[PDB]
Ligand binder design. Structure first.
Ligand SMILES: NC(=O)C1=CN([C@@H]2O[C@H](COP(=O)(O)OP(=O)(O)OC[C@H]3O[C@@H](n4cnc5c(N)ncnc54)[C@H](OP(=O)(O)O)[C@@H]3O)[C@@H](O)[C@H]2O)C=CC1
Ligand SMILES: NC(=O)C1=CN([C@@H]2O[C@H](COP(=O)(O)OP(=O)(O)OC[C@H]3O[C@@H](n4cnc5c(N)ncnc54)[C@H](OP(=O)(O)O)[C@@H]3O)[C@@H](O)[C@H]2O)C=CC1
Lengths: 397, 397
């Protein structure tokens, strides 16, 4: 009976979500889809044990299995190493999976028709990709800064004048990119638009920085022809470079439903729980999905002592849906996506029905305006999901 | 009878606004306040005549008279030089006044309680300052880029590795700043908060770029102590550096009423006509105010042929109010500010009364939802202003 998803890697999370992660697993995941879960613990409690080697292993799993998902996980900081008695600050597993897989992260909030928004006229979400090191130095006194490319083989030096500092000091910075890096940001950006079937819009500041951002605009349009052009004329999708303002002008002058690639990592007006992050590798195969929000300190301080907490587990539900929908298309299981496709609405319908958790309730009438009879708490929201779903399956399957 | 404003420079504008500028002058300005207007034409039609020398003169006026105002004006571009038969593309008078006066531009939309917004819970506007050249180069092949500070006197070279490029090429850029430039951005930022009496919040990406953005955070807090500290403890105002997200988190988690200084020029969610730009020189004296929006191609194509147009002249009205309120405090004329203070509400009340121009009407029900009986057109909106004002004066003065 259970549906066949094959190999879907998974990252055991942390703190409050880790149970939300289990609650989601226990409820909306396990009773329905059979899978190959290689489930690795990214808990910092497993990061004092194996000395980080699970994480790079975890990354390698996706690189083979082609699909990870990730619950929220703590980045070790000042409080952690003292309060968890950590052997060392371990590298941020967000970047620790990214740097390994490379890849581009596409954040988007989810559209619930009844909740407030930066734009009431956004029907479909704007999926915002972004590119993201840099050297910086304080040039404490007058002098001529020069950023000089010196070739590797002995070829002519390339001299540039950043500025010649006279009155007072200055400050400066280097910044760089690679065709590898940009084509990484390129294919991953087009593949994201392929799966989402939405228009792609790149934007750089082209006139303000000519050669640097022109290369970005250069490289998509070179790839948007030689590579993706036919797949875009099919299924109507198109790539239009725009200027930042010539884009953000039509940001609200458009409704949504397009992939949007920034050259400049949260921002947005969407409540954190709303947004679902996704990570992809230009290959169009490896796809690592996660919640877009922190590991929820709040609700957790109210967790250990048993009190009633209300937290919105949608971004984590979609981490599965994205993982599963991007699982199916890879393996061509039309059953599995349908499960995933339907589970989105199931998570949307409940709030569309007006039955929603605090943050949504708390944003409707205003922040103190929230009351327990205007929402539902956390553990009880995983109930209605399988409920609504199993029925939204019942007629379907 | 007429009020004494003294010397207030003025920039004759262009296109559709230039008449809005005159309509505002004719109606809400001339019959009430006497002034010393040195009124210079920034029209591109005066930029084929004097060969740009009025502009730098215009800038020098403010530098002495301490107050300019500016109507919108065309930047010469491809269409202009052919259609106006321009002798040359003349430098953008926005930057042509800025570079001369230096100074920082503080954009803000105006708050009308009845109009939609990025945040329904913003009572008072967020005044967004921003800092804003850069060298960029494409390093077509493998090599080691280095940004090397070489001192002016022969002192030890300072070597940095941007990156060493191997597989494929790269791209890079230089970027720089000056204490002069940042303290320019500093004093001008604090003075803006002084006049507006609002909290100042600087934000840089401090942890992502340590030394470069730390210097900014360095310099305000150095100035926020040694200079403005006492004036801020008085009148309760405070300067809190925050991180970009640790700011934008409280952007909507706060209502507004604070000056907000970005290190990174429109953006925003506010309709262009809403926002009023202001330009200030760290001296806290020279203040050049203007509308924040383009010179309105639309309405103008519909202008020459006599048809009924509807365009919202609030940003230009406030250019005077800001110019006049920042005029009074300089010269201590309590009459003149009161005129200016009151004129803001007069421009706010009319729309608060629900009587508003198209864009506001057109944003209330949606863009095609606009109808002529849901708003009022342009020439007729300068009527109600002096009307409401002269009465809002009548009881007052
Ligand atoms: N995995 C990742 O991508 C990220 C991981 N983190 C981890 O986050 C933890 C730090 O907690 P923090 O970063 O402060 O995130 P927190 O959630 O603890 O605080 C951030 C805000 O997000 C909002 N939020 C988060 N989840 C929900 C939800 N389910 N429903 C409603 N609102 C929600 C809350 O606002 P309210 O509850 O008031 O609505 C909360 O105040 C650390 O462990 C850090 O490592 C940090 C950033 C992202
Ligand atoms: N002085 C300055 O700071 C600036 C000057 N410019 C000048 O602007 C001109 C170019 O026109 P553009 O830049 O396209 O600006 P336009 O106004 O011509 O188009 C921009 C949009 O602004 C909106 N807008 C402008 N004024 C109003 C208003 N009073 N009420 C409602 N909406 C308004 C319009 O949207 P709708 O009408 O659909 O509501 C318009 O489509 C050039 O001459 C350029 O030099 C350019 C940028 C700013």
């Amino acid at each position: 009976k259970k549906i066949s998803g094959g190999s879907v890697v998974e990252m055991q999370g942390d703190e409050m979500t880790r149970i939300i992660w289990e609650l989601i697993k226990e409820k909306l995941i396990f009773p329905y889809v059979e899978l190959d879960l290689h489930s690795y613990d990214l808990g910092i409690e497993n990061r004092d044990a194996t000395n980080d080697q699970v994480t790079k292993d975890a990354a390698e799993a996706i690189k083979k299995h082609n699909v990870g998902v990730k619950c929220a996980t703590i980045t070790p900081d000042e409080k952690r190493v003292e309060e968890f008695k950590l052997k060392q600050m371990w590298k941020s597993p967000n970047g620790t999976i990214r740097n390994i897989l490379g890849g581009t992260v596409f954040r988007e909030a989810i559209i619930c028709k009844n909740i407030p928004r930066l734009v009431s006229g956004w029907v479909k979400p704007i999926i915002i990709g972004c590119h993201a090191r840099a050297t910086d130095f304080v040039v404490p006194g007058p002098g001529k800064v020069e950023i000089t490319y010196t070739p590797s083989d002995g070829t002519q030096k390339v001299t540039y004048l950043v500025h010649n500092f006279e009155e007072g000091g200055g400050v400066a910075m280097g910044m760089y990119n690679q065709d590898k890096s940009i084509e990484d940001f390129a294919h991953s950006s087009f593949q994201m638009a392929l799966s989402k079937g939405w228009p792609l819009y790149l934007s750089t500041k082209n006139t303000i920085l000519k050669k640097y951002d022109g290369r970005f605009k250069d490289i998509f349009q070179e790839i948007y022809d030689k590579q993706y052009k036919s797949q875009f004329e099919a299924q109507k999708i198109w790539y239009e470079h725009r200027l930042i303002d010539d884009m953000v002008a039509q940001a609200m002058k458009s409704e949504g439903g397009f992939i949007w690639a920034c050259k400049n990592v949260a921002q947005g007006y969407g409540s954190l729980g709303m947004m679902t992050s996704v990570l992809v590798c230009p290959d169009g195969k490896t796809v690592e999905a996660e919640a877009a929000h922190g590991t929820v300190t709040r609700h957790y301080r109210m967790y250990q002592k048993g009190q009633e907490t209300s937290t919105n587990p949608i971004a984590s539900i979609f981490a599965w849906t994205r993982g599963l929908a991007h699982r199916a298309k890879l393996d061509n299981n039309k059953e599995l996506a349908f499960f995933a496709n339907a589970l989105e609405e199931v998570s949307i319908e409940t709030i569309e029905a007006g039955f929603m958790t605090k943050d949504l309730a708390a944003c409707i009438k205003g922040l103190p305006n929230v009351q327990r009879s205007d929402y539902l708490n956390t553990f009880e929201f995983m109930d209605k999901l399988g409920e609504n779903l199993k029925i939204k399956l019942a007629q379907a399957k």
